[PDB]
Design a protein around this nucleic acid. Sequence first.
DNA 1: CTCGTGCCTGGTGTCTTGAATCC
DNA 2: GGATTACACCCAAGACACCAGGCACGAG
RNA 3: CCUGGUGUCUUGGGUG
Lengths: 168, 58, 93, 518, 262, 84, 88, 171, 35
Amino acid sequence: VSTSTVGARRRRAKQQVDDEENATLLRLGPEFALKQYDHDGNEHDLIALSLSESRLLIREALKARSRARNGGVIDDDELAKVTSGAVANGVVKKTLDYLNTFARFKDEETCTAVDQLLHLHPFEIAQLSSLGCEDVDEAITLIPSLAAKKEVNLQRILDELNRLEDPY
Amino acid sequence: EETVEILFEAGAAAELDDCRGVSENVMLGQLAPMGTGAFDVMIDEKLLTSLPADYAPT
Amino acid sequence: FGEMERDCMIAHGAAGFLKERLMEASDAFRVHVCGICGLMSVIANLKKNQFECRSCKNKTNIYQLHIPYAAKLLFQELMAMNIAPRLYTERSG
Amino acid sequence: SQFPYSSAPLRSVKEVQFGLLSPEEIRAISVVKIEYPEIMDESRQRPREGGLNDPKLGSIDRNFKCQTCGEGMAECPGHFGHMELAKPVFHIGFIPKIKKVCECICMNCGKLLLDETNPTMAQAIRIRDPKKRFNAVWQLCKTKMVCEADAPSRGGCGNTQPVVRKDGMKLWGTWKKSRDAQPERKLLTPGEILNVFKHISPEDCFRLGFNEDYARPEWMIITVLPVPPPQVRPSIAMDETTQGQDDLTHKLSDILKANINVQKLEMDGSPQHIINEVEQLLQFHVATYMDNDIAGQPQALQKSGRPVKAIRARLKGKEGRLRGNLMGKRVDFSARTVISGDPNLELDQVGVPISIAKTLSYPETVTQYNIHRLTEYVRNGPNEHPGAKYVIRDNGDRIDLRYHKRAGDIVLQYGWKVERHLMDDDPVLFNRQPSLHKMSMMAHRVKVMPYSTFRLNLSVTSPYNADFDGDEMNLHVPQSEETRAELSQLCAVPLQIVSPQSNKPVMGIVQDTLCGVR
Amino acid sequence: IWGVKVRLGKEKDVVRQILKKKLAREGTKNPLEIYSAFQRDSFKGHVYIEARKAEAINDALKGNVNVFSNNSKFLVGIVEYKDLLRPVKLTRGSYVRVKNGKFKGDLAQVDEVLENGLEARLKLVPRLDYGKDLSYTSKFRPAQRLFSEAEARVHEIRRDRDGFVTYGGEEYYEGFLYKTFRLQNLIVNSINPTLNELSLFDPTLNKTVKIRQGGYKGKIGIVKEANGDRFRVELHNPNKTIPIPCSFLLIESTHGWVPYED
Amino acid sequence: ELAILKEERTTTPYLTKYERARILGTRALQISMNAPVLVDIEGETDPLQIAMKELSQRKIPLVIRRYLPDGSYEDWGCDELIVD
Amino acid sequence: LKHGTYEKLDEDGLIAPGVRVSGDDIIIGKTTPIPPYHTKRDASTPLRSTENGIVDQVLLTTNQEGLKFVKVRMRTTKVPQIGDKFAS
Amino acid sequence: MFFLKDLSLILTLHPSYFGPQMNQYLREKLLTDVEGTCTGQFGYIVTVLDGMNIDVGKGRIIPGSGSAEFEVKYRAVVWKPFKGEVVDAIVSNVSPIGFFADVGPLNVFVSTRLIPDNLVYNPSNSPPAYMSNDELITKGSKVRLKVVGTRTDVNEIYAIGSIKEDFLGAI
Amino acid sequence: GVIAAQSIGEPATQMNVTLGVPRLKEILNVAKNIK
DNA sequence: CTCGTGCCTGGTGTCTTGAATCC
DNA sequence: GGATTACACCCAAGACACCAGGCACGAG
RNA sequence: CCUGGUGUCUUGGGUG
Ligand SMILES: [Mg+2]
Ligand SMILES: [Zn+2]
Ligand SMILES: [Zn+2]
Ligand SMILES: [Zn+2]
């Protein structure tokens, strides 16, 4: 039905088992290669999004479109009624509410601070932001790929994440 | 001519047929790149905008 | 509609007319192909709306074609003699 | 439109990739294994599973749905089976190429007898065309009469190579054992050659002009036979309740019987000289199943005495699949009758008999501008002219107006189609055989007339090389809005007055009118 | 031992002919110097001949019209001799497939064998009609169904024992036919049970019409099609079928041509 | 990429007989499927006639994509091509 | 069964002389039984689709094998018209 | 796991829709057909970016049928989960065979043989929960699980989790 | 292309050096030994 | 009543030796 | 040693054999 | 109360 920029995938003599999606082994399949191409043929890094980025973009896109539907005229339950159809109403409401209960940095002030702090494979950089951690010991266990990289700063990463983190 | 021999030989040497000939497309029943089929026809979205607004798709 | 009548329509450049004569006005047939291996090996249940090329384990990259029935017949006779005619819908160079 | 809706995207064919079917792939697309030559269960209706008419292969009967795709016989393409061979046999089409490969490679390990160190040979691998490269290589290596273990180690085995000769369906290799001594030529069985071919390296596979993904060289030996569905070999009823089988059906039974007897040998009484007679016979049946015009040996015969119609003979010649059904074919919406002249018709008109005009039709789409006009045709029905034969809905269901007794209760919706009778000024393509040049096919405007001949204005007899001594001509009716416009704007008679053949007219004033005008 | 190719089906004849030649020449100055000859059914189209010199093989076959004239004889190895002469089941309670008669192809249980050892009593699902059309072949037989003695009682029978009836001179015990077959008439090897065995074990059309008004008044015809109001009469007089309104017709009935009161 | 800019178009500025026939037929077809017609329809109600009327007034809303041998192409609108 | 009319056959399965026939009308009714009621299959002969005329004469007899055997001769009259061919 | 993907959809347009607001109709048409749907190749398509400004290109007219074919290139927010990815969740159901957890659009099933023995299902408690002493798994409790297997139905995808490993569970 | 083929073939169908059809045949068949 | 012979149906399987030019 | 040898169309005129086994009928 | 299948392979004689 719907297709992408990546095409053909004609048969090759040697098979491959670096295709099976394994986040531990950095296998994201043929569609989510490290170097993608946009609809003009230009080269582009894979766009993986943390929970904090994603909350701003999706909410902005929905209210800008909602304003556009109103000729140019906050709460998650109100923002999800913009969609068309009960099937669409469901997936969008559940995604905001899920993000509403797990996004630490729920505003653009803190988020841009986290944005500048983080901006080396692009997938790992996005993983560190999504999974909250206390110490260096907790990060290399649950995410065993950070082992043999020999470039920490990790502690100051976690300290800034936890300091920017508002109380609850 | 040499109909079957061509096709056996074509198999054994994995020939690729790029379907640019008239005869290729005729026997596969597709519009051949000749005469009225030598070009594509596109819809002029720019010229449609000069029509009045009550003709609009909803 | 013999070989010599085919040539006359080419000379007139009436490509559209020639296509219709040899398909819609005769033995037009719809086949399904696998986007990976290019064979007519798709098993298509249209009321259940489920398609599968078992060889490629592929249920998503599948296309339909309009070809003459006598061409479909030709390819099955070629398959029976171990010749693989793979129909791809895109070029690559 | 005659096809039910399917969500799969519609595309056209841009490339045809030829190649060979691997043994593994044949099994992957097969839906059943074929073992028993008895077609019927026990002559008590319903054909035997695992037999040659196993219902999983498909339906050629209007009342049994396919047990694989669920579709009716019209849509169901048929699905292949497979037949395992007890012993690998040669493909009859590829023997002379197999023979060529033997002189190129080592008959022990299978490596190309020459390297890039040889200057002329290094030039030959650069040749871009696979066929010419393969021939250029073989032209060099032909005279190399020993596979060297050592470079001129290259991976060689040191053995001298035989001179392989073809003797019918058998290949004989004569090895020169190390002046002159005694050489012993033994038979090079398919199984022996099969194992040798699988050990050819990928790098030498490419250099031989073969292709690792599409035409791998051991696939020229047949180990499992694809069983075509019944659509390829339909049954026919000679005198209603008596049906004979297609030549392929009988021939597949013979291969299947012969296959069982090879299994019947290796487990008990094999006097060796019997194994060679039974294996060669399996090779024979598989060969004449594909090609029954093998030079130098008698043809396989039916019990009627006439030769078996092999697959190769199905495709060649004037009546075969290519010249008889694909480069040309029989077509709908055509008509033919004797022609007569009429001076009181315009140059671009053709007089069409009423009876022909009621049989042919054009599917005119219903719009706001003609809906009132088209309803009048519907009330008149198929037997009064000007009338109509069918009303086609957007779903495709046709209403046959011969049998619709409540014809007065039809209301037409926009977008439907009415197949109305042929009517005045419709363009049609007119044609006389033999079509020697492009003005053998010109578009004329219909004028419906009584009596059963086609009428031509006399000045068009010359380009058709027609006269009225018994000649017949053909009429073809375009079936859509796009082709009507193509006929009137490209093929119409007045556009054809001057021909590019000799930059001069091909029509003039003729016969009576020319005599009289002087 | 040499093998020789012979016309299919003529192997026994060639063995016979060789024996006659041998016996006829015994003790003469030109004896046939072969020891034996034989033909194995499993080895179609071959005869084997025992001798010391190849010339004796040619001598044995000279003039034999069943032998291929091509110099096709072949030598057998000593290590292959005994296998040429290898001579080669059936147990009560086991299944076999019948090879002859209306029960051809049917699965049957072996009930017992004759004392002499030739025919075996088989237990079979019957194919009967209960004498329904009496005043059989394998192509015009009946479906299989267990014998029903009450159906036989109703429709057409001798009781012999508990659950045993003789019906039309065949024996049925607990619904099964018990019938003797030659052992050579049953298949005991490589039987494949089937799926089925696993389950078991307008009133004026076409009437003649006269036309009473119009240009065709007085002509005979037949109503070919009567969709509504407009009829299709196949006129007799010219080879044409016309469209005509219903007011114009007279129909034939018991008494003359009657208007639209029929 | 393949598309050639408007200022650098090199193919002939006259409508060819083949382009004309395809344009008339395609536009005719669309009208019979009840596409909005861009000219006044008076007495001439045949699908082909309406399409021929639109052509004569330079009002057919279609673009010709003329393929060149290498695969590149120039898009020409039927509003700008000169019809004899 | 065939699509044409069976109403011109008499009870003996044969049409009688003097009856006009048109295309696809059945003139000889014959059945064949279906092997293993409602057991037979039609094997009847229709008049050629392009013809008409009058049944002129019907021969009934038996052949060398003893089964029944019929011939039906149809006559019509052809009147010259536009398109017919003539020669000195 | 969220990504931004540049996608495209082939749209066929009937000729009766050839009016001055054609593009705006197509923009509405794209959104109705794509938003909220799932595919095994990309995952759930959550929202499309910059919907009212998408450049649809030019439509190819299909020979012989009159209808027009647009290739609408676009950019969307997509959500696909992955095997090996550790994620948080909100439990939707608790049953004798494990629990079901809503991670945004879909639901993940964790079976009993991959749950530690000390977490005991307690129906008598009010409200029902998986309980310990300093642990509390009620509906809405943050839990940390790891996706160990993805199965594809091409309509909705199904992922199976596990809490049979270190540092996974309630927090 | 096709126009060229018909333009040359059609006159041939109605038609001491060799001329007419036998000479035409020598050309297309580019015979090494002409008559 | 039993045995033998003839006819019909079904199943399986081949073989005495006997038009001309061109590439 | 094969492959090449105009196009389309109409219509009338034809079809497995031999051997073995089983069943039925007639005669003794 | 809608759907609705009648053969093939040759050979020979003809038409332009
Ligand atoms: Mg003439
Ligand atoms: Zn595939
Ligand atoms: Zn099927
Ligand atoms: Zn070697």
